[PDB]
Design a protein around this ligand. Structure first.
Ligand SMILES: *[C@H](C)[C@H]1/C(=C/c2[nH]c(/C=C3N=C(/C=C4\NC(=O)C(CC)=C4C)C(C)=C\3CCC(=O)O)c(CCC(=O)O)c2C)NC(=O)[C@@H]1C
Ligand SMILES: *[C@H](C)[C@H]1/C(=C/c2[nH]c(/C=C3N=C(/C=C4\NC(=O)C(CC)=C4C)C(C)=C\3CCC(=O)O)c(CCC(=O)O)c2C)NC(=O)[C@@H]1C
Lengths: 500, 500
């Protein structure tokens, strides 16, 4: 169980979903050798929809298997383009070209339905009206609602990954008869690393039919490159079976997933579900993204500005401390006479200054002997860099007896034996999981992972834990350490004299 | 002259400013072998400031040449750190570590002045107040003013690269006695490609003394890697001499340059100049960037939203056309009865529909025979993709006689012989250059480039040229072509029947 859990986690992080050679059944995939546009490989479903199989096809080229009206960046202008064939029966595709990271042309023919197109005044009309009409919550809700408006989906949500790559549904529009996922929290193993890295490279993933059986590329390997073909940028690649199994027991027949990138990292996803299978054409997908992205630009801007705002809060405290410190006598005197500021510097409720032989406690701290034993623990463990923890109990067992006052500890050293300590109380935090995280998935045994069946609200109460240490707060704490080091250095050179 | 101009341009794009091995004189550079932190190479200026040269130093390690209070991502926590040495004389540095793209540790010791620090309430106090107190112009001016406030610089500007990588000073704060550069336009050769690619990787470049003579790394090559060391991420690397020569005749003794990135491309620069040499410490630099970046996040958001807004303008036109087209008889009938919409679709003043045997002109066009000869020119040149030009004169010489009505031409083909054309009139555009662009630089001859001496306003009048074709307008034009192709395809399958 514990061992099975362990390597099953290691199996998730390493999955090769991109080197899988199976395509969704509704559309055709071909990989083109050139200059010529010869068909080296093709999906097996061509038999059922074209009529000419990997007998008649393969190396007969795109030229005249299809009709229409090795290149380079011209692919962009070709995306999408109408390709059609007559086989007695008239099929019309919208083809989308791309080149792999390996550097070979894949063409993905989706059945085109749009001979007649669009809602009133385009896919954008209503959505733009809402965006202009203007807080972060407003942005969150506009995405999911106006995307659900454009699309016709049973459920549309905004899924935001946290610092541990878990995720939360932070916004949702849905039919009123469906049970809400708003505010549910999900394990990181649901969207494992290989799936997340895909969304840095592939901004859209659509699955019009979950129950559709994936057909294999023939041959499974590329004849030229001597490898499986990388379908990371692939529209028609079939999602890993486990994820399909995951969507089935959640009750989803179709999905559209658009990823949101901040500063080149996966911030989150616009996640769309349908109970029934559904056609989401290319132009619609591309529309939902362009909108999603514009609002996200504004989301990114806001959270950036809120981040800068908190940084200046802590910057005021620092300055007040740096001013009162230098100008007063012992720097320790300056720090202690302004508790409010010392505590605010890192968003904490208590602190301790251990310098030379004097030990000063400020605010809500553990009692002196307790902090003094902690300081010895800090010394015994040879802390040189910078130490913080949101749950001191679980690394310092004795800390359980003052978890009320110091479940959190930020500890910064100032040379040998000297420390600055900030303390934080236990704050009970309730997490609302989408299902029991103790069985986030299940492994059978030859390791075989299977997704969980229930996703019903499962309330956790997190204990023996403070608020988490934000990075701006730790940097602030080091800004003080550096200002203190500045003063020791100022003294040092005040006692230095030149030459003779 | 013309040949000299040509290869001198080719020399600029290929310069290896990053593989130069010369460092600025005020600070020390060392490259550390490890595990050990041995000094493999070091700047020659150590003699003049440490007292121990590449005799006493080299392989004596950072350990005890310096005092303080091969790693990995711990470099971040070490940046910056106080390093000091006593050599009878007490020097105090602020060291900043980084690892190359080649993967080796470079340590850059800047003389530390800040034993006593900061303005009131930190480097941010005033700047944050302005940002919250809230259009793009507002953002532009807040950057340059509040940066000039924080810094004490003689001139601070916002430099924005255009589509051709030329640039414009779009915002500026300066002493009132200095001649303004606001609104001046500069050649792309001033910030050549190698300099631009540097700012994707290195967000800050500071030169506290332009006149300071660069000292060489000894040895010039790294002994382990067998190459010159890549100083792209280097603080203390000396800017290429030509750029220093460029700053001298502009009258700049010191500069600080912070780059602004949108969606992973170089949008622009916060460019700071001082007439006199100036010390800009690390913490100040890092402050100016963090602020600059926060406001830029809001800039990026705004221009993104203005981009989306124009896209919806054109999206309305398209929809109106797609609606009136299909439902009416000949699609050409629908398009022609709504000239306003057809012209607005691509922001143009006239158009022509050439389909089958009928040729319809709309709005301000060249006369029929002229457009008909143009259509033959379009046919004779075998246009298959999509053709546009902001100056039709210079590719179609005869177009000079109707430059008043069609200096600009967007031309989209709909299968064989059929075209959609949009026309745009000559609009006189005046460019205000910072100096005569005809002598943007000068080459002597063994090619030796030298920067220009004058940067005084040089007014250009651009002729025979329309407004430039934006990408949203071209895509819009193709959205119509695709909707027309949809209708031909709809007919095609309306005449198709199944089986027997
Ligand atoms: C299989 C045993 C394990 C597993 C693997 C896995 N997951 C994915 C992909 C996704 N998971 C999500 C998750 C959600 N979307 C939601 O709307 C919600 C809550 C309502 C959740 C939790 C998403 C969005 C994706 C990808 C986007 C998409 O729809 O495709 C993959 C992807 C594989 C691929 O080939 O693309 C894999 C292999 N998931 C599990 O739960 C098991 C632990
Ligand atoms: C030399 C013959 C050619 C040349 C080379 C060159 N330029 C640069 C770097 C920069 N150029 C700019 C330009 C401006 N900054 C401004 O404020 C203004 C107007 C007021 C201009 C035009 C900038 C900002 C930089 C870099 C930033 C910095 O300050 O360092 C390089 C860089 C080399 C390096 O090693 O970093 C080189 C080689 N410039 C010319 O004009 C000649 C054509």
């Amino acid at each position: 169980t514990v061992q099975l859990s362990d390597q099953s986690l290691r199996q998730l992080e390493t999955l090769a979903i991109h080197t899988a050679h199976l395509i969704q059944p509704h559309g055709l995939v071909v990989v083109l050798q050139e200059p010529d546009l010869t068909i080296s490989q093709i999906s097996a479903n061509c038999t059922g929809i074209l009529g000419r199989s990997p007998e008649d096809l393969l190396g007969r080229t795109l030229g005249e298997v299809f009709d229409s009206f090795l290149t380079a960046g011209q692919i962009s202008s070709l995306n999408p383009s109408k390709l059609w064939a007559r086989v007695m029966d008239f099929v019309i595709f919208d083809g989308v070209f791309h080149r792999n990271s390996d550097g070979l042309l894949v063409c993905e023919l989706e059945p085109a339905y749009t001979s007649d197109n669009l809602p009133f005044l385009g896919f954008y009309h209503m959505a733009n009206a809402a965006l202009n009409r203007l807080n972060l919550r407003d942005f969150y809700d506009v995405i999911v609602e106006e995307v659900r408006r454009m699309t016709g989906f049973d459920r549309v949500m905004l899924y935001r990954f946290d610092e541990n790559n878990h995720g939360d549904v932070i916004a949702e529009d849905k039919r009123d008869d469906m049970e809400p996922y708003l505010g549910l929290h999900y394990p990181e193993s649901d969207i494992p690393q290989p799936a997340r890295r895909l969304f840095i490279h592939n901004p859209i993933r659509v699955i019009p039919d979950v129950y559709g059986v994936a057909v294999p590329l023939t041959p499974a390997v590329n004849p030229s490159t001597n490898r499986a073909v990388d379908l990371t940028e692939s529209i028609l690649r079939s999602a890993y079976h486990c994820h399909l199994t995951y969507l089935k027991n959640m009750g989803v027949g179709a999905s559209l997933t658009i990823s949101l990138i901040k500063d080149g990292h996966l911030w989150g996803l616009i996640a769309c579900h349908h109970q029934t299978p559904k056609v989401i054409p290319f132009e619609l997908r591309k529309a939902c993204e362009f909108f999603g992205r514009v609002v996200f630009s504004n989301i990114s801007a806001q959270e950036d500005t809120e981040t800068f705002d908190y940084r200046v809060q802590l910057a005021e405290h620092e300055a007040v401390l740096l001013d009162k410190m230098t100008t007063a006598a012992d720097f320790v005197e300056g720090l202690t006479n302004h508790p409010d500021r010392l505590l605010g510097l890192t968003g904490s409720q208590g602190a301790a200054i251990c310098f030379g032989e004097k030990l000063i406690l400020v605010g809500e701290t553990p009692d002196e002997k307790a902090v003094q034993y902690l300081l010895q623990w800090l010394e015994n463990r040879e802390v040189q860099d910078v130490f913080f923890t949101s749950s001191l109990s679980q690394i310092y067992p004795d800390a359980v007896n003052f978890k009320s006052v110091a479940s959190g500890l930020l500890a910064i050293p100032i040379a040998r034996h000297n420390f600055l300590l900030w303390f934080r109380p236990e704050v009970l935090q309730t997490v609302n999981w989408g299902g029991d995280p103790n069985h986030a998935y299940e492994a059978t045994q030859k390791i075989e992972l299977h997704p969980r069946q229930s996703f019903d609200l499962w309330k956790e109460i997190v204990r023996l834990q403070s608020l988490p240490w934000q990075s701006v707060e730790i940097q602030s704490a080091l800004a003080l350490k550096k200002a203190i080091v500045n003063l020791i250095l100022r003294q040092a050179e005040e006692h230095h004299h030149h030459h003779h």
